[PDB]
Write a protein that binds this ligand. Structure first.
Ligand SMILES: Nc1ncnc2c1ncn2[C@@H]1O[C@H](C[C@@H](N)CC[C@H](N)C(=O)O)[C@@H](O)[C@H]1O
Ligand SMILES: Nc1ncnc2c1ncn2[C@@H]1O[C@H](C[C@@H](N)CC[C@H](N)C(=O)O)[C@@H](O)[C@H]1O
Ligand SMILES: NCCC(=O)N[C@@H](Cc1c[nH]cn1)C(=O)O
Ligand SMILES: NCCC(=O)N[C@@H](Cc1c[nH]cn1)C(=O)O
Ligand SMILES: [Ca+2]
Ligand SMILES: [Ca+2]
Lengths: 340, 351
């Protein structure tokens, strides 16, 4: 039963990838119908408006071809997908920017470089054979952070639950070599807050780096499924690196429990992120929202020793740099050690 | 005669929403407690202050409800609203509860010392342009007519009136009108009131105390307008109220033109009602309030298109600055913040 319900969920996501163009063409048709409803004197003020909609339509069609390339390369009547899933699909396109485009570099350096520096600090070659250091990256997203860690020689495993992320990371990590071969239009659905009409249809390219350039003897892998269910072996991991991850929990205390169980004595958990609880005030969903002060008190009561704590680490997440409206986070970075 | 009744129906709908705040917020907190109480007992024992913290939030909810009932009491007994009448007790919608939460945050932006930094980024650039174009050496400020559409809680219109200009604020939303009538007419003592504008945010809290911290208002006495000043506020749609052409020396729009169903209609109204030689000062982003909503018209223009439309009307561009950084009802202690790269422009209707 559970295995087939997963197959039902599997096809539900395949269908969403295939419904992208339909969903976006309908949104552009709404904008076009409203423009044509305007008095002719106002339409005449904007002689490029309908042409610009045609450029958006071309970008939609291109994005849809990328999405089909992803869906085809992970297999070997399109029914209307839901609004929840089309939003997750739009976020997935933006994820290619953060994880695999030059455009996403400044974001990666704010989020990933502090984690990588702490791994290098705690697992130096003077003390460890890196190939024997087992590092787990739960909620690895499109896999760039786990990839960076494996590029250093550590045995790194990323884990991911979302098929949106697994289909896409499978494509980038296994069907991509040629730097910047591919092109996406990730901002075409934002019609607000554009300085210039061109900003909305601008492309991004990926991958900025060759994913098949892992060193000889690298140990990189990716698992599919609920982090809290896949990882049952206690005292297994040297290091767990969570990035924008622990606020995805129905109950973050369970995440902390799992991380404690599966770390080796002496192992470390590195965390960087905010506390945007993903199930907060969502209909009929468990969500325990803790302040950072409460999370620290749970961590201390568990027995972790605090080795690093920085608050107010500024970063963005899939930010559109040209947008007239932007979000940023004052993340917390901490490194805690399971006592040996 | 049908507007007379759909407006009345809307008025009591907003009153009822103000009265429903406590019920709504208390339900949210009761959901939090129920979910906490269903965790394993050993996890509950890791947080021995959690239930007491919910109790502090519940006290903040009651205090907020008291402020909202004071606003209600003030506007029900306002002579101007006798046309609205005096038998249903419906629960309010989620949309209106969201508008109530935004309304509490506006008090921070417009009438609290906590909001001073935000005001100085949005309101000072507008005010400097007014002083620049109607300097005291050459203009009797009391004969300069300045319209502030979408005035919200009114702080900007008030600041302009404080300088001596004949300033009128305009606002459509009953949430803003009820609250601004209360602040501008009844809050005559600095920092006498407080409210708890952040208690609804359970995410991105550094310390639990941050969620329940108060803000005080008003930071200035709104009745410290000097003798000779000329300050007023109108109720209703900017496009329907102002139909006389060639009336205003200056129109000042702050975080406003992106509320339009069709921003071209706003631009057209502004051009008609300015005196020849008058100026339109604008500062804000382009967050179109009706974008992608079923059965709502929304024309989303890039800033480039807005400037092109403005130029085609015959406005002359005198000031243009992009990337004017500002926040909007920002929670300074939150771990997640939004900001805007606004455009400031000053355009002149040719004489
Ligand atoms: N229980 C879970 N097990 C595995 N993955 C999860 C789980 N919960 C959430 N996720 C994924 O965690 C990721 C959270 C992302 N915000 C972060 C992605 C990535 N770490 C990044 O910084 O870009 C999402 O991709 C989720 O699909
Ligand atoms: N057609 C309209 N006529 C009058 N007021 C409007 C209209 N459309 C939107 N508003 C109000 O414009 C205001 C927009 C606010 N974002 C800005 C308020 C204020 N200018 C501030 O900067 O704090 C809201 O209070 C709206 O209720
Ligand atoms: N302005 C962009 C903000 C954004 O996309 N946050 C994401 C990712 C996130 C935030 N905390 C943990 N994961 C989301 O909402 O899921
Ligand atoms: N980060 C807080 C954001 C916020 O409240 N923005 C207002 C802003 C706005 C933009 N133009 C007119 N008003 C809204 O969405 O109504
Ligand atoms: Ca109690
Ligand atoms: Ca007084």
């Amino acid at each position: 039963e559970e295995e087939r319900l997963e197959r039902e969920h599997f096809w539900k996501i395949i269908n969403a990838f295939r419904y992208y163009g339909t969903s976006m063409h309908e949104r552009v048709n709404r904008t076009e119908r409203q423009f044509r409803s305007l008095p002719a004197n106002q339409q005449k003020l904007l002689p490029q408006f309908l042409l610009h909609l045609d450029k958006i339509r071309k970008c939609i069609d291109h994005n849809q071809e990328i999405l089909l390339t992803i869906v085809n390369d992970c297999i070997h009547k399109i029914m209307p997908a839901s609004t929840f899933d089309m939003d997750k699909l739009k976020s997935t396109l933006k994820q290619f920017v953060r994880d695999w485009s030059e455009t996403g570099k400044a974001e990666r350096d704010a989020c990933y470089q502090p984690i990588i520096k702490e791994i290098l600090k705690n697992f130096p070659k003077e003390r460890w054979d890196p190939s024997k250091v087992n590092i787990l990256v739960p909620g690895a997203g499109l896999g760039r952070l786990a990839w960076e860690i494996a590029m250093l020689g550590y045995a790194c495993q990323g884990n991911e639950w979302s098929f949106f992320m697994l289909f896409s990371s499978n494509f980038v990590l296994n069907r991509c070599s040629e730097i910047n071969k591919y092109k996406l239009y990730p901002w075409i659905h934002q019609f607000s807050n554009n300085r210039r009409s061109a900003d909305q249809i601008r492309p991004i390219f990926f991958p900025d780096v060759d994913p098949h350039s892992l060193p000889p003897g690298s140990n990189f892998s990716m698992t599919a499924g609920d982090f809290q269910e896949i990882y049952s072996e206690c005292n297994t991991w040297d290091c767990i690196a969570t990035c924008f991850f622990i606020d995805t929990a129905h109950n973050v205390i369970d995440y902390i429990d799992t991380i404690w169980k599966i770390l080796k004595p002496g192992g470390i958990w590195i965390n960087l992120g905010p506390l945007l609880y993903h199930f907060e005030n969502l209909a009929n969903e468990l969500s325990i929202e803790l302040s950072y002060e409460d999370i620290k008190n749970v961590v201390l009561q568990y027995g972790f020793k605090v080795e690093v704590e920085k608050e107010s680490v500024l970063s963005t997440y899939t930010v559109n740099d040209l947008s007239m409206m932007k979000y940023y986070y004052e993340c917390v970075l901490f490194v805690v050690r399971k006592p040996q």
